[PDB]
Amino acid sequence: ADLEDNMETLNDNLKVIEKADNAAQVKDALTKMRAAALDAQKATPPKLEDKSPDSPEMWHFRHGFDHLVGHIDDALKLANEGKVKEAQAAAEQLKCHCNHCHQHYR
Amino acid sequence: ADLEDNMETLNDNLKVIEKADNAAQVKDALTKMRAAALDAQKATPPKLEDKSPDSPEMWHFRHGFDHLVGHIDDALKLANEGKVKEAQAAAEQLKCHCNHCHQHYR
């Protein structure tokens, strides 16, 4: 899957958590988002075509996925503790990670 | 200033920027936010006095402030371009930084 693929996965599943018909769908969507974020971290965004892999732009790009994954894991723990409403509430705050990285590089 | 007074400065000047409609007003408010953020950036907070200065938790706390200062700086540059509304949208996007650090600390 490519960067555009990974972003569709993240967008589709973030909305699944918002609209989840049952609590089990939240964990399933978080799982898919974690995979998509780790895959996206290995891509080069088009607006950073010309920059070094050691550039601060690419550093901040990759770091954003690390941090996103951290907070997805926080949400998964809540869901794995059966605290599925708390997990759904946490998942809505993930939108800040999307918005922040997009500000820079989308 | 103390932590509570710095946090109030950040809180009020966000609304100053929302209320404003010209570049000088937005720049003035962002400069105040930046000074408030730098004032609070380096102090260990009460809940982590027993944590090492290089502990994962202190590291993430300090990065919260470093990253907030970075985006205030970016918004300030937009205001210095006369891009009032882009500067205002960036300032609204700062709320993600506020809530992220709060949820970690509280």
Ligand code: HEC
């Ligand atoms: C950086 C660390 C990012 C994080 C975190 C998220 N996204 Fe993203 N996204 C990023 C870039 C650089 C781009 C541009 C990709 C390109 O090839 O142009 C995107 C794009 C999207 C898109 C549009 C995809 C497309 O086909 O054009 C969507 C729908 C999207 N992103 C959604 C999304 C969501 C919901 C996120 C949080 C869960 C998220 N992204 C995180 C960089 C980064």
Ligand code: HEC
């Ligand atoms: C850590 C990296 C922080 C960032 C970034 C921001 N804040 Fe904060 N805030 C932080 C602490 C440790 C505290 C004190 C402990 C607590 O949880 O209250 C605060 C407190 C505030 C308050 C007062 C809370 C109240 O009940 O009135 C406000 C109003 C506040 N903070 C505002 C604020 C804003 C607007 C921020 C972004 C621009 C912001 N804070 C960032 C830690 C951190």
Ligand SMILES: [Co+2]
């Ligand atoms: Co965090």
Ligand SMILES: [Co+2]
């Ligand atoms: Co940033």
